[PDB]
RNA sequence: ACCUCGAUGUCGACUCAUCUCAUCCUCGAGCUGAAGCAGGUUCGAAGGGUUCGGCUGUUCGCCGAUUAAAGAGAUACGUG
RNA sequence: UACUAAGUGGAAAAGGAUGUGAAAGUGCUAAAACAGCAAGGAUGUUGGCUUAGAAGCAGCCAUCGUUUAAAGAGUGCGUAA
């Protein structure tokens, strides 16, 4: 099993999965298929390795906390947590948590909120 | 380097250090102090070494207190000379330490940190030290 | 504590006749003897397919013996019923070995020929000319012969060349 | 082998024993062997 | 404390007194994702899967007045699945969960007050 | 300033050495930022050996060529 | 009547030590204790600063929330990532 952050719009120049016995030419078309709904983003993909050289892949969301910068309206958070540079409404956090649901292993939407609350505090952002 | 600025007389007599710790007997400022178990003369150089060791292993979180201070002077006749004909010049100050005097003490930092800092300092002093916690 | 641990002496062929200082353990593979010391403080009592040893006193030496002889009895029993073995991978470039009857030889980087007498009660076998498997009755003898074989070319961290115990992870060092 | 008068563990797994009336210490890293007090 | 242990036994005993299924499973070869995945598949909030120590299980079953159920929890790692109402689906869920994974044991349990064995798990599934 | 001033002849060189190990080589071993060659440090070890010359009264030293090595000291700074 | 395993007795320091005896407390423990062994030790994170190459590990910045019996923005080892 080797995870990699293959870009969603491009898949063709490369060899570190070739030592796995992966047939690169047959899977490059598949990477550009389902990912075409979210072009221009770097999508992480899990790669299981079956003995028979069959393979099944699982795409994931764009990395957490990147979205928090957008909701805050500020390009970068504080280097010091005590310095409350930004503030975000709890309703806006609901919009963010829903996007991450496929990646998040959180049991409930209410718990999914709590998981994002520990990420908002890393940026020093107030939860209002 | 700890040193008196100026004194009255330059060549005082030696001061004994075999007693039971008149003054400085108990910890007074921190929650952990260093206590000797055998009185001896410890000079300013060792004092500075212990102070800088504690400062370096302390960090910007707490404080450290020094209790003793080299008030008494000490003479040393120069090299290659017959005795007699006056008394030698003063060379190095020294703090008299009677057995059982708190002399170093720190505070406001984790407990194992007091233990490690005081043990680090104690290996620079000639006297056989002992860790003491502040009373309740 | 191992000292008071129930030894399950299965009555397959293991018979244990106790003397003043002899313990003769015999089985399908071969008789094994244990030389007891004078005035051993342990007390050896055996029940039907059950063996248990007890200490007369609580002194430190008796406490030690209570475990050492329990372990030795268990080891002798398992050896006489099953037999131990050690596995050697003699890996290298020109490194190889084979057996000439009672005497095993080795071929290493030595300009000198190496021969090693196989003692009594031990059996050696070479599946692959670079692969050795020593088989014996007592753990002590087979281990002694294994380290005797190993002494001629110890493993080194730079290259895997040398005599290596089976299931051993040797350290690695990179020299340019 | 480090013949040092004050032996103390350096690694976490460095265990100290007393073999032949001489305290020592053994670690998987052979750079920590000590002896003699 | 003695009180804390008694409360845990009493709570478990009371739960087993209203259950429609108690099924005993070895927790061997169960990954953290598998622990969350099996619980997630058990979807409907009427069922639980928990690794429970044998001594608690034994006292709880004993005080719930269960018998011959000791063998399921005897000398083995023992997670428990306990469901409510329609209990049959829970057994199929755990049976298809192992099969999807490398392995897992399914010792047996009680279904609607009736003992079943390990072999009978397949019948129910 | 304690024995010797009604005398204990003091530097160096030559001859003969003997002893200690805090080891220079030969001997055994551990570690290494020890690939090998070559090393560095440490442990064990006193059985044996430890060069020839220029300058200086010289020990000491500098230099030259060597050897496996050109050890550190003690013996009234061994030895009229 | 105890203690000593060192010829301690029958010389000596700073310091180190699961030597060993005694006493006073204190924790767990038979609804099972410690050690060993068999399983798992997860998610948001490949967070960002930055190094062809730093993404749990070249270092640095707050360094936490969630699922769960369990869990470190990873114990250390160990990777150009
Ligand atoms: Mg005369
Ligand atoms: Mg003459
Ligand atoms: Zn170590």
Swiss-Prot record, chain A:
Family: Belongs to the universal ribosomal protein uL11 family.
Superkingdom of source: Bacteria
Cited function: Forms part of the ribosomal stalk which helps the ribosome interact with GTP-bound translation factors.
Signal peptide start and end residues: none
GO function terms (MF aspect): large ribosomal subunit rRNA binding; structural constituent of ribosome
One term under GO cellular component: cytosolic large ribosomal subunit
Assembly information from the UniProt record: Part of the ribosomal stalk of the 50S ribosomal subunit. Interacts with L10 and the large rRNA to form the base of the stalk. L10 forms an elongated spine to which L12 dimers bind in a sequential fashion forming a multimeric L10(L12)X complex.
InterPro entries the UniProt entry points to: Ribosomal_uL11 (IPR000911), Ribosomal_uL11_bac-typ (IPR006519), Ribosomal_uL11_C (IPR020783), Ribosomal_uL11_C_sf (IPR036769), Ribosomal_uL11_CS (IPR020785), Ribosomal_uL11_N (IPR020784), Ribosomal_uL11_N_sf (IPR036796)
UniProt PTM: One or more lysine residues are methylated.
GO biological process, one term: translation
The protein's name: Large ribosomal subunit protein uL11
Keywords: Methylation, Ribonucleoprotein, Ribosomal protein, RNA-binding, rRNA-binding
UniProtKB/Swiss-Prot annotation, chain B:
InterPro entries per record: Ribosomal_uL16 (IPR047873), Ribosomal_uL16_bact-type (IPR000114), Ribosomal_uL16_CS (IPR020798), Ribosomal_uL16_dom (IPR016180), Ribosomal_uL16_sf (IPR036920)
GO biological process: translation
Species this protein is from: Mycoplasma pneumoniae (strain ATCC 29342 / M129 / Subtype 1)
Protein name as it appears in the record: Large ribosomal subunit protein uL16
Molecular-function GO terms, alphabetical: rRNA binding; structural constituent of ribosome; tRNA binding
Gene: rplP
Function: Binds 23S rRNA and is also seen to make contacts with the A and possibly P site tRNAs.
SUPFAM superfamilies: Ribosomal protein L16p/L10e
Family per record: Belongs to the universal ribosomal protein uL16 family.
Record's keyword annotation contains Glycoprotein: no
Keyword Ribosomal protein: yes
UniProtKB/Swiss-Prot annotation, chain D:
Single biological process term from Gene Ontology: translation
This protein's UniProt keywords: Ribonucleoprotein, Ribosomal protein
SUPFAM superfamilies: Ribosomal protein L36
GO CC terms of this entry: cytoplasm; ribonucleoprotein complex; ribosome
Molecular-function GO terms, alphabetical: structural constituent of ribosome
Similarity-based family: Belongs to the bacterial ribosomal protein bL36 family.
Record-linked NCBIfam families: rpmJ_bact (TIGR01022)
Name of the protein described by the UniProt record: Large ribosomal subunit protein bL36
Organism the protein comes from: Mycoplasma pneumoniae (strain ATCC 29342 / M129 / Subtype 1)
Gene: rpmJ
From Swiss-Prot, chain E:
Name used for this protein in its record: Large ribosomal subunit protein uL10
Organism of derivation: Mycoplasma pneumoniae (strain ATCC 29342 / M129 / Subtype 1) (Mycoplasmoides pneumoniae)
Parent-protein start and end of this portion: 3 to 127 of 161
GO MF annotations in UniProt: large ribosomal subunit rRNA binding; structural constituent of ribosome
Keywords carried by this UniProt record: Ribonucleoprotein, Ribosomal protein, RNA-binding, rRNA-binding
Function: Forms part of the ribosomal stalk, playing a central role in the interaction of the ribosome with GTP-bound translation factors.
Complexes and interactors: Part of the ribosomal stalk of the 50S ribosomal subunit. The N-terminus interacts with L11 and the large rRNA to form the base of the stalk. The C-terminus forms an elongated spine to which L12 dimers bind in a sequential fashion forming a multimeric L10(L12)X complex.
Superkingdom as given in the UniProt entry: Bacteria
Record-level GO cellular component terms: large ribosomal subunit
A GO BP annotation: translation
Family from the record: Belongs to the universal ribosomal protein uL10 family.
């Amino acid at each position: 099993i080797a995870k990699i952050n293959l870009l969603g719009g491009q898949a063709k120049p490369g060899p570190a999965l070739a030592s796995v016995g992966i047939n690169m030419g047959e899977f490059t078309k598949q990477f550009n298929e389902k990912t075409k709904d979210k072009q221009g983003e770097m999508i992480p993909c899990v790669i299981t390795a079956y003995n028979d050289k069959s393979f099944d892949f699982i795409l994931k969301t764009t990395p957490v906390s990147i979205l928090l910068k957008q909701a805050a309206k500020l390009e970068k958070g504080a280097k010091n947590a005590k310095t409350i540079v930004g503030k975000i409404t709890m309703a806006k956090a609901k919009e963010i948590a829903q996007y991450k649901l496929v990646d998040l292993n959180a049991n409930t939407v209410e718990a999914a909120l709590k998981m994002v609350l520990g990420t908002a505090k890393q940026m020093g952002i107030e939860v209002i | 380097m700890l040193q008196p600025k100026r004194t009255k007389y330059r060549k005082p007599h030696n001061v004994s250090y075999e007693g039971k710790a008149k003054g400085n007997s108990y910890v007074a400022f921190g929650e952990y102090g260093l206590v000797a178990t055998k009185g001896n003369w410890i000079d300013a150089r060792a004092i500075e070494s212990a102070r800088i060791a504690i400062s370096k292993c302390l960090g910007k979180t707490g404080k450290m207190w020094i209790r003793i201070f080299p008030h008494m002077s000490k003479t040393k006749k120069p090299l290659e000379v017959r005795m007699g004909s006056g008394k030698g010049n003063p060379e190095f100050w020294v703090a008299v330490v009677k057995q059982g005097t708190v002399m170093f003490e720190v505070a406001n930092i984790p407990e194992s940190q007091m233990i490690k800092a005081l043990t680090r300092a104690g290996h620079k002093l000639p006297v056989t030290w002992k860790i003491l916690k502040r009373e309740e | 504590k191992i000292g008071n641990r129930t030894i399950t002496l299965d009555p397959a062929k293991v018979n244990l006749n106790f003397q003043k200082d002899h313990i003769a353990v015999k089985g399908p593979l071969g008789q094994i003897e244990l030389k007891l010391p004078p005035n051993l403080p342990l007390k050896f009592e055996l029940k039907d397919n059950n063996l248990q040893i007890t200490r007369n006193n609580e002194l430190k030496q008796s406490k030690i013996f209570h475990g050492t002889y329990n372990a030795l009895i268990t080891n002798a029993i398992i050896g006489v019923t099953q037999g131990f073995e050690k596995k050697l991978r003699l890996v290298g470039v020109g490194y190889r070995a084979n057996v000439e009857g009672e005497t095993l030889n080795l071929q290493l980087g030595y300009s000198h020929p190496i021969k090693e007498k196989i003692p009594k009660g031990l059996t050696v076998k070479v599946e692959k000319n670079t692969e050795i498997t020593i088989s014996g009755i007592s753990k002590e003898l087979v281990g002694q012969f294994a380290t005797e074989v190993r002494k001629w070319r110890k493993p080194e961290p730079y290259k895997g060349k040398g005599v290596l115990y089976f299931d051993e992870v040797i350290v690695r060092k990179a020299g340019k | 082998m480090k013949v040092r008068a004050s032996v103390k563990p350096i690694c976490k797994d460095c265990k100290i024993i007393k073999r032949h009336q001489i305290v020592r210490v053994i670690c998987k890293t052979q750079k920590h062997k000590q002896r003699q007090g | 404390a003695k009180k804390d242990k008694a409360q845990q036994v009493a709570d478990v005993s009371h739960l087993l007194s209203t259950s429609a299924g108690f099924v005993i499973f070895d927790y061997t070869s169960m990954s953290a994702i598998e622990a969350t995945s099996i619980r997630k598949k058990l979807f409907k909030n009427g069922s639980k899967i928990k690794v429970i120590k044998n001594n608690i299980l034994r006292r709880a079953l004993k005080a719930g007045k269960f018998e011959g159920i000791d063998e399921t929890a005897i000398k083995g790692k023992l997670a428990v699945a306990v469901g409510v109402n329609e209990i049959v689906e829970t057994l199929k869920a755990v049976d298809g969960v192992v099969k999807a994974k490398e392995a897992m044991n399914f010792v047996c349990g009680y279904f609607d007050n009736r003992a079943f064995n390990s072999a009978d798990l397949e019948k129910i599934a």
